[PDB]
Amino acid sequence: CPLMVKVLDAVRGSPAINVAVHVFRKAADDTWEPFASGKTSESGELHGLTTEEEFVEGIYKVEIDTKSYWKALGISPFHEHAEVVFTANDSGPRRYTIAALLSPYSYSTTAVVTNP
Amino acid sequence: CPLMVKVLDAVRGSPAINVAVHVFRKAADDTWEPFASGKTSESGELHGLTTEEEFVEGIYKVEIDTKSYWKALGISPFHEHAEVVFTANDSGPRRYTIAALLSPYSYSTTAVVTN
Amino acid sequence: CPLMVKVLDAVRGSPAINVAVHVFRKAADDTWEPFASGKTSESGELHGLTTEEEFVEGIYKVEIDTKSYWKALGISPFHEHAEVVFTANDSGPRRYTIAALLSPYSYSTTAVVTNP
Amino acid sequence: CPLMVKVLDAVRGSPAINVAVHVFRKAADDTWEPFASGKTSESGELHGLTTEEEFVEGIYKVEIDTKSYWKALGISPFHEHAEVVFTANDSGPRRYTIAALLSPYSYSTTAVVTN
Numbered sequence: 403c404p405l406m407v408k409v410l411d412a413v414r415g416s417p418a419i420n421v422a423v424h425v426f427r428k429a430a431d432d433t434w435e436p437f438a439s440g441k442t443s444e445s446g447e448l449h450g451l452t453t454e455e456e457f458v459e460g461i462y463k464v465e466i467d468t469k470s471y472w473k474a475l476g477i478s479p480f481h482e483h484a485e486v487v488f489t490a491n492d493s494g495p496r497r498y499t500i501a502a503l504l505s506p507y508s509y510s511t512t513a514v515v516t517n518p
Numbered sequence: 519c520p521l522m523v524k525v526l527d528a529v530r531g532s533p534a535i536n537v538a539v540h541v542f543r544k545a546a547d548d549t550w551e552p553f554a555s556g557k558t559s560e561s562g563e564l565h566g567l568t569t570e571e572e573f574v575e576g577i578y579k580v581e582i583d584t585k586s587y588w589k590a591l592g593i594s595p596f597h598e599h600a601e602v603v604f605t606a607n608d609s610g611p612r613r614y615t616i617a618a619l620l621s622p623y624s625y626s627t628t629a630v631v632t633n
Numbered sequence: 634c635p636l637m638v639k640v641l642d643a644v645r646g647s648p649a650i651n652v653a654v655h656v657f658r659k660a661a662d663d664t665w666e667p668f669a670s671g672k673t674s675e676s677g678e679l680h681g682l683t684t685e686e687e688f689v690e691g692i693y694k695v696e697i698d699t700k701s702y703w704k705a706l707g708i709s710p711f712h713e714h715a716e717v718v719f720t721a722n723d724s725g726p727r728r729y730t731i732a733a734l735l736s737p738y739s740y741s742t743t744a745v746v747t748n749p
Numbered sequence: 750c751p752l753m754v755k756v757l758d759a760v761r762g763s764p765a766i767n768v769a770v771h772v773f774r775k776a777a778d779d780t781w782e783p784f785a786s787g788k789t790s791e792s793g794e795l796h797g798l799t800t801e802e803e804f805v806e807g808i809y810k811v812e813i814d815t816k817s818y819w820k821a822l823g824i825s826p827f828h829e830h831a832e833v834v835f836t837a838n839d840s841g842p843r844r845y846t847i848a849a850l851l852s853p854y855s856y857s858t859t860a861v862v863t864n
């Protein structure tokens with residue numbers, strides 16, 4: 403899969419399971435078009451968001467619903483979400499792994515970008 | 519100073535200077551209304567973005583133009599920007615420091631909320 | 634494997650390949666006994682450091698040679714290494730994934746700890 | 750103040766206050782010689798660890814007792830401590846800020862090296 407989102411809970415040192423992830427793609431008129439969405443699995447990984455055909459060049463935004471995640475665990479987090487906005491596939495198709503490492507008042511988002 | 523944005527360069531171990539930061543308040547129609555912006559100073563800090571009177575509860579987005587910063591340094595960045603979206607809670611009093619640690623393919627943002 | 638070390642290069646958005654990783658275990662006399670070592674693979678992952686039999690309770694230190702890594706890429710990094718010191722298996726055997734996210738002047742080390 | 754340690758709590762979004770920090774200098778026999786220590790203040794910062802005269806080039810270890818901090822808060826931590834090991838380079842002048850962002854199962858440490 404060309405786009406994978408991984409979410410870790412840095413409080414529990416665990417995959418962040420059942421985290422909603424929405425992917426949007428910036429349309430020609432600069433709106434965010436819904437591109438794909440999903441939930442992280444039991445491994446904190448979200449696979450199959452898209453395909454190599456569908457995942458064309460563009461600016462993509464990945465909004466990870468970190469607030470609902472923290473809230474379901476009784477935590478009032480700082481952020482509404484963890485975002486990742488990036489140009490994808492500018493110099494040809496890549497595999498993107500987006501790793502979000504979550505704490506209630508901090509997150510980090512990293513891209514592991516590999517050439518398939 | 520109820521809101522202060524601090525930006526660090528994890529590649530050079532330095533303040534990320536001259537980083538454009540835009541703050542938006544979520545408007546009733548779910549759109550982002552420009553609220554404040556600035557450039558990080560020589561200390562990587564952006565003060566005076568807002569005032570206590572202006573900084574009411576609401577959802578705020580802090581957009582840090584991390585891409586232009588990395589471009590200015592000649593390093594290919596992953597992200598278009600860093601985008602900190604949060605609810606100002608105002609169960610107070612509260613100062614917000616938003617620290618963004620910046621690497622070309624990674625960033626962290628942390629809120630240090632005090633007082 | 635009960636202990637896995639993953640290393641990512643946050644500058645290149647890539648696995649940090651061929652990174653030396655040394656694992657020590659705190660002996661009875663508070664010295665660090667060499668426990669295991671290895672290199673991260675092409676995926677930035679180091680598997681097979683140890684086994685469930687060998688990986689008994691203890692305090693373990695994982696020293697990731699981040700300096701040699703950065704130096705081989707022409708970068709003078711801040712840290713000599715990325716360390717992780719933790720008590721392992723205190724309430725029974727666990728799987729530990731240690732993820733180190735590396736920048737020349739910053740690193741983050743996260744543990745994904747799962748119950749096998 | 751050539752060396753300043755700052756510790757943040759990523760769980761509470763606060764300075765990590767009263768965090769024990771030990772600084773060691775690597776001795777010629779490859780062992781760690783205690784050099785300086787302190788507790789983070791109410792601002793999560795530990796100043797006055799050393800002086801310019803004392804802080805010569807060398808390999809330093811900053812041990813942040815993250816475990817006791819998490820215990821004091823009732824949260825099971827992963828790490829025994831956070832351990833920042835680095836060469837003071839002294840191609841100068843140089844101030845070192847070591848920021849440690851602290852989560853129970855994760856920490857980041859960043860050096861902001863200025864001047």
Ligand SMILES: Cc1ccc(Nc2c(F)cccc2Cl)c(CC(=O)O)c1
Nearest residue numbers: 410499501503512514639641732743
């Ligand atoms: C290609 C890739 C890159 C990084 C990670 N892990 C990762 C990371 F990159 C940041 C924080 C936590 C974790 Cl687990 C992973 C998943 C893993 O560590 O097994 C895959």
Ligand SMILES: Cc1ccc(Nc2c(F)cccc2Cl)c(CC(=O)O)c1
Nearest residue numbers: 524526615617628757846848850861
């Ligand atoms: C020179 C310097 C560098 C970083 C920080 N803050 C900081 C922080 F407040 C949280 C996580 C990382 C960092 Cl580096 C600070 C303190 C601050 O203004 O928040 C100073």
